[PDB]
């Protein structure tokens, strides 16, 4: 398929995977822990979401040492997944500056080439003429 | 009338609609659910706010399967609405430099035009001379 959907859908697929992993890891890692209600996968499914989008509603979350290492990794994964998609939108914004800067080197380079070239010509004409003022007049 | 307010106001309108939809869907979808206080629209109105701005105070939120699908859609919609306004702040600050750099093109361009066209004025001059030197010295 179109690549812009392959690099965009990828970060989207990699996003889901981690939004399904933290809800897969921070669940079984929350069994037998003080204040560990996050013992269900479907409930942790929403857990990794509020973790990625860094919302932290505060109703479902870990309390273990290993269940927190997986949580922080879901926090950073979110910032990464959206920090890249935001700087990618800039490619289409500052990328229209390229087309504005490139549509500029044209008009400016065009204005020159004429000036110059119309000068090389100014010489030939000027050259032959003089040249015609010679040999011919004499012979 | 304008094209930057129609594309900006559009994402602004599309924003409100979804900010009015989640508070319209996640409300009736939160009736008869464990810990479902989000049964009111005005309370769910603030709900979609903390969801978009990803603050998640944790006092008003869904617990259903369909009420959460609408919630995550409001989470992403927020990031998208502010991630664009941010990349738009860059193109606006980087695009302004293209104007001052485009003016830099005026000083570097129009200066070269007038010069290469001041030499042309000369090129002939010297030619003119030589022409005379002959026609004035020979015939």
């Amino acid at each position: 398929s179109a690549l812009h959907w392959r690099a965009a859908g990828a970060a989207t697929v990699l996003l889901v995977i981690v939004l399904l992993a933290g809800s897969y890891l921070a669940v079984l890692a929350e069994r037998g822990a003080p204040g560990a209600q996050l013992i269900t996968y479907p409930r942790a499914l929403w857990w990794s979401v509020e973790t990625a989008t860094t919302v932290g509603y505060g109703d479902l979350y870990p309390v273990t040492l290993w269940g927190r290492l997986v949580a922080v990794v879901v926090m950073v994964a979110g910032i990464t997944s959206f920090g890249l998609v935001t700087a990618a939108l800039a490619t289409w914004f500052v990328g229209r500056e390229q087309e504005r800067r490139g549509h500029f080197v044209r008009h400016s380079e065009k204005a020159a080439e004429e000036a110059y070239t119309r000068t090389t010509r100014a010489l030939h004409e000027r050259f032959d003429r003089l040249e015609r003022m010679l040999d011919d007049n004499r012979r | 009338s304008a094209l930057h307010w129609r594309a900006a106001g559009a994402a602004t309108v599309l924003l409100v609609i979804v900010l009015l939809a989640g508070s319209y869907l996640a409300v009736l979808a939160e009736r008869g659910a464990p810990g479902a206080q989000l049964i009111t629209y005005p309370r769910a109105l603030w709900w979609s706010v903390e969801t978009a701005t990803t603050v998640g105070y944790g006092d008003l939120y869904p617990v259903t399967l369909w009420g959460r699908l609408v919630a995550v859609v409001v989470m992403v919609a927020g990031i998208t609405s502010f991630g664009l306004v941010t990349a738009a702040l860059a193109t606006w600050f980087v695009g302004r430099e293209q104007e001052r750099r485009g003016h830099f093109v005026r000083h570097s361009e129009k200066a070269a035009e007038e010069a290469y066209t001041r030499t042309t004025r000369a090129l002939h001059e010297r030619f003119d001379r030589l022409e005379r030197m002959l026609d004035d010295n020979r015939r």
Partner: antibody
Amino acid sequence: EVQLVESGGGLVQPGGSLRLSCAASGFNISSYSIHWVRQAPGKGLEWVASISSYYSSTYYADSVKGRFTISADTSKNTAYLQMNSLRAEDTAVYYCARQPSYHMYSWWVALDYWGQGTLVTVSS
Amino acid sequence: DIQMTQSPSSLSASVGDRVTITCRASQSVSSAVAWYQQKPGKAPKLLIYSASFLESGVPSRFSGSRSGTDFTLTISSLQPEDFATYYCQQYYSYSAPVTFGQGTKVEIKR
């Protein structure tokens, strides 16, 4: 067989504009230069422009300047005169004629092959 | 720019006669003049180029001579039809280059 075919002449409301064409026939305008010489109604001879399409150059007499715009097209083989902002006095018999470019002994025979001219007749 | 002064304003004479017209360049014109004959109705006809030689296929009674700045066209033994309107042209300037003289009309007298 070399020849020229001025065309486009006619009547124009004082102020209006016209476009004359000088289709070449025997020579390649390219390596040549075309002249637009006009002649008042019954008066004498006056030249208006010239354009050595070889050296990408154009020329105009003073009697005209911010108005006429000589220009040729070598894709086809014709020289055109774009007479703009025509003035009552501009009416006449616009002929167009040759002269070789600045090249080997040819530039010396003046306008060696004149055309037959058209008649731009401006008037309200 | 170079202008042109041409005499005689209007010339009258019969056949056999010898006609001589003059033209003085308001400026240096390195033998860059040409001689034109325009019979009312048609367009000019090149007679003399370089001010010296004559366009291939022209009557022998035709010629020109350069006087530094003064140019003169002479018709030896004026024929019957050689009557027309004669034009003096300078083609030197680089105000590309054609500038015609007011002209001299030679009307055959009888």
